[PDB]
Amino acid sequence: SLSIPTIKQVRAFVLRGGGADYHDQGDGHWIDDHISTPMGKYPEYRQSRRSFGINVLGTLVVEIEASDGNVGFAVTTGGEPAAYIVEKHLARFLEGARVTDIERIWDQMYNSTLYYGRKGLVINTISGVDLALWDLLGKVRREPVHQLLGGAVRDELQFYATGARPDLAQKMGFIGGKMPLHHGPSEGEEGLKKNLEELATMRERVGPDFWLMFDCWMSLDLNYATRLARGAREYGLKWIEEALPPDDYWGYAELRRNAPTGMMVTTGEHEATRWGFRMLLEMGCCDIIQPDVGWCGGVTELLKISALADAHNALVVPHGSSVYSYHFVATRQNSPFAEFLMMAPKADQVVPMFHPQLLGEPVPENGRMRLSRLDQPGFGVTLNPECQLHRPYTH
Amino acid sequence: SLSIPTIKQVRAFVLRGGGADYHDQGDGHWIDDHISTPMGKYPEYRQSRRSFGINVLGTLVVEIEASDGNVGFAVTTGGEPAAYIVEKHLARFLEGARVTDIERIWDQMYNSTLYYGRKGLVINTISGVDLALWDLLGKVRREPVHQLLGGAVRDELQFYATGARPDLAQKMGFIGGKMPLHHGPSEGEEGLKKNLEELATMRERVGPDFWLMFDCWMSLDLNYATRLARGAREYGLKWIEEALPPDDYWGYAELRRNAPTGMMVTTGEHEATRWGFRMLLEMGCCDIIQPDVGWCGGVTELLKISALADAHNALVVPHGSSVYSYHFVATRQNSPFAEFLMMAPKADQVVPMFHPQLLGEPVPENGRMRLSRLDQPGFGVTLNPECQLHRPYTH
Amino acid sequence: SLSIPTIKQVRAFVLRGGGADYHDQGDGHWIDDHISTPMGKYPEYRQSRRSFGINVLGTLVVEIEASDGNVGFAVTTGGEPAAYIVEKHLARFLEGARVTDIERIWDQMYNSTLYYGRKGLVINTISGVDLALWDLLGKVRREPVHQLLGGAVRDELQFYATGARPDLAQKMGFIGGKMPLHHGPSEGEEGLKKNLEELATMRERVGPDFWLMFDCWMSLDLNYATRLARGAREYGLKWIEEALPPDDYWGYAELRRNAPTGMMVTTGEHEATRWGFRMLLEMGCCDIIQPDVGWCGGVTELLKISALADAHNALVVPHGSSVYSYHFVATRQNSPFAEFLMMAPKADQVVPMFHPQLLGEPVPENGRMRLSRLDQPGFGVTLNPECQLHRPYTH
Amino acid sequence: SLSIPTIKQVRAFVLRGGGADYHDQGDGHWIDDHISTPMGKYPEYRQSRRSFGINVLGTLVVEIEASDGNVGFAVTTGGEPAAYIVEKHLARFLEGARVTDIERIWDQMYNSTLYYGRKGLVINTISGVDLALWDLLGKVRREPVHQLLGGAVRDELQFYATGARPDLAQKMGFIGGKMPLHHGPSEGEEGLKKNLEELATMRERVGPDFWLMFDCWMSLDLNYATRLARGAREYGLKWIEEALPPDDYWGYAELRRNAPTGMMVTTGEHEATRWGFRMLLEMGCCDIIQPDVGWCGGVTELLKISALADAHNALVVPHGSSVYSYHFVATRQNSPFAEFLMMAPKADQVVPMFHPQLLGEPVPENGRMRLSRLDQPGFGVTLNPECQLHRPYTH
Ligand SMILES: [Mg+2]
Ligand SMILES: [Mg+2]
Ligand SMILES: [Mg+2]
């Protein structure tokens, strides 16, 4: 049988400016233009999410070198504190292990960090290592990750675009456009009117069939979300996303019940592990779960989260994670379409989602992506040599 | 990247005499010695399960030849009627497909047979094909199946033994002994006393720590099972298995609630798909689910069933399926120990579980199985040339 | 009215060796002596919790300097990664604020870190800052923290002692002794017998009335915990703590239902926020919630958690946090007794809980602590000059 | 540390004519002009609430003198019978106690009156003493009560006005207008038509965005309330308040379910303690709880009620209690806006809510109140020397 290499060393680097950390941006970007958030109730933190620190972490790069010379890697959000965790804590569970010990390594990472993990940063870190491991395994086997995950179930991926210009997204071939909500509860009725006006304007431009969705980034309360959803019915809003904070399971269940018949309620990008998603599904909190592969626990855990959704006959549409989501969703019956975040400042052109960190990163063409483009080993990308890496720790 | 072969042809064969169909035995075997079943209420069908036709199907052998010459295969219960389904119906979804299209092929087999499937024989058939596909993928990758399923999470498997001699199993290093219940409700109080006498005798021989369990093969009613469990508490019975018919979800939940504190209720060998097991788990029907990989939908579906169990923090101890279960359970955190069926007529020695069909089949060595022993490609076994195959159908 | 000062600067430091991070110990300590944990299923990580990295973070020291010269501080678990969060992210919400803006500062810290927080390390960090804020407010007001929290409701605190020697704790005046469980599920029946033997031995030494408890540090599964509790009834075990991982709300509810009548099930030291505890209380997961003030969100959030418990008429016995818990529990009707960790290596004498970091730290005197002893401003302690602080980051 | 004074004496006085007892009015006031109540079914008690005795108690004034000369006080509804309770019963728990023993004193007051308390008058009395204690503590510390309650979370309070002239309230800067319902179930369809006509007239005058609410003072039945709410949908009614009697928890839950999507159901001004509000929240009886600080148990208990609402992510908008509510709500994230009762006979001008009892009482200016106006110690008000006090009892 094939001689399986062992893991020689694990390394963590930090990278800043775009890439995995969607919000690690500069000035003039739609993704930081008055997005409604839980902090919006404070005027001083309403115009910019960066002002309250959404960009304090940056990107965590994890590299895993095997005894055969192969090197797998992945990028996610975490930066220096995450690098500390990788170098000082998690490395011990990987070094010396066979590259195929995926399930065992994940279990040790999760159980060993349980005392300060469960959700958030620690899970982001575990996800990063996990992705790097799958990248390495793919490289060792000389096959793309989708083939290690049961194979694709569709010949191409179809995308909806997230950004402030759903009208421009339609012209680019996308199947729908998810817009950021710009006004929250603290802006009262005037803000609600402005929210609905924005949706109305886009509906007029795109026609009655193009999909339109609202992303609320955990910024509303039950009543406001209920009224926004009801008011959006007139414009055929397909779904309302992350209306409430992730810990409010009860509120999501109520919102889904009070929502217009046919309109979906989605959430999950800030939820983690099979247990977090079990709570969402069992309490009937949403119609679509949206875990981020780089934050929910990685591919190993997403496989379990996905199977849970399968049993619940629920749709799983991961929070756009570049090739990390593309390789995964291609193999899932429960993920008929995918999210493509428009990282161009004015959302007026398609650019790689994790630009400029990944070389070889495919992007939708007329809103689609042929599976044939994901034919390289692992996740099929290489780290851009132009991105200055920083290794804050060693072990 | 590696050149993935396509599937050239699928073939179905029938084999009789032992093997995958555990009950396809001759005379004098403990496995057919007055085992309590739902038919026990009829004196004419009480002594032998073969009398009511538990051995009417025999073994289904599925072979899948790839364009590179590799041939994967698997064995399960189904015989001629299953071969008909494989050759006349399922073959079309596999031939021409890339060997890595596992998820897509499974979905097509299940959705195309829904009108006459869901559970039973049709799922057994789908499972056999699925197993042959995983064997083939392992051979193409030149790796044992456990490495394709996330890698082992333990260095060895530990087994409990199923048969009429738990005392002898103890001497052979097994961690426990599950014995068949010989008397059902129609045999009244005398039968109940006999059941408890057999347990008492074995408990006396093995000491207070050795695990002892009762397998009831769907033969009881709620009250009888309740009383049997209570009476068995005095002997520290670890669990009572398949006390009721598979369709009685409600009864299982009630039984589990009325069971002695600490004693477990298990079931599942006659349950199929992620949805069947979701019902068992959500309704609180059992403490351990026991799907048979060759009957529940195969490895592909068992992965999803297992993930569901993970979310429910439930134990999964698959019904023994020789190498097909060994390779799978080795990779699951939720499967700490495994079942080994004692197929020797008097359960007084260890013999290959699927004897005589599988050459190279590993047997437990003093109740354990080092993972280092499962180092060959696929499921690591070959079809015994001695077994005369029969090809009932072609396509 | 009193002139309220503003916050001039917040600083984060890292300290190693004992202190707030209970597990940051050296060799020969009972607290690292074969404690049962979720990693115990791996022989390599069974003897020492330090081997899997329970001591990788160390202590986070937060200092908050006000415009009047007063400086509040606190210690908790978090180290360098937590310091990064404090300096690079949280500082902005405090500097310039009036020292009395506690509720507003907490809300901003939590809502600004939601995208990578909710539980774990980020909450530990928020908790440390919150504790330093309360220490500062107490110093500005020139009053002990208990007087800022509604005043004491008892004249003295009474403690139960946690460590491997409940017998010695009895001789030192404590009201009970909580001992660490040393064997988990992977150690089977032999381990279960050993666990019960240790309990039996201690019960024999202390008599039938002295309280005895078992701390399981998230290491069991439902069935094992069920059997351990039943076996411990013979020895009058008062409660079984953290039997299951924090994310298994469903399992806890089941365990509490199957627990011996009168025996309590407790958990919560690894749970955070009002919402995490709402889930525990509403689902009937435990009889006593045990949040750690330095990990659950700080005093500000613990006040809300405590009020929730009040409505549920539930007991709240916070995980011991030295003066940070003493000042809080003294004011709560729902916290009749408190936890005191025996940090002496052999748990054979009383030493300061957060030794050697806090000068002026009060120790129980014959198992009790008169409130008259907590008469100094804030939390009444000073940073030990001996401890060499490290300032990893600035802002 | 600061030397904390003790309580020297507690005194209770009675005051009549306006003030704390909102309904202790004379002729010609909107607050007594055909308000719908549970007694409305009797024609003789329909025109005036005073006719059935809503004004039989008057105001209870509680004074607490400390050893340092400081004197705290508060006003609420209770009069002579409440004074009896204060002087003859509650005084014993306060005199001799340190002014900071807030939690202990409250507990003793509640537990000692449990046999004839729980809700109603007795709790009003406890609330009065509790407020006087917080006023005293604020005076001793020389800080406004909001700073003792975690500090303000907003720079100003925004108010909606309660009275028969929401149109005039809009012109005065208020954010909304809550109108009293004038017709109940016994007036049949004619009365329902008149109720909706009144709402229609006000909606025409104020425009589509100004908030309009209906206060029903416990006067309806489930069906009538359901039909009124449905009929008010046309006029964008924001919420329907106290539709049913306080003991009908089941009815409130049903009403909230049958209510127009987006319209809120509120109640609680006649509910008391953490347990009363737990029942409301857990049974899903309302979207907003409206405890009166002077009737629900005081600030000490409202802190617990508020925390409960926090866990339930529910809005808390206290039933206008002058400075007693202002100081509290300023510190709560869950109380974004406040109620201001228009005590002017024709609701055509702003006058102090507790006029003429409190000197130094702030009032909304153009519908808002800067937190800077609540800068005096305690609740910042003094008893008006012109109000003839009466001390019916001594002890
Ligand atoms: Mg989103
Ligand atoms: Mg069985
Ligand atoms: Mg503990």
Ligand SMILES: [Mg+2]
């Ligand atoms: Mg009202």
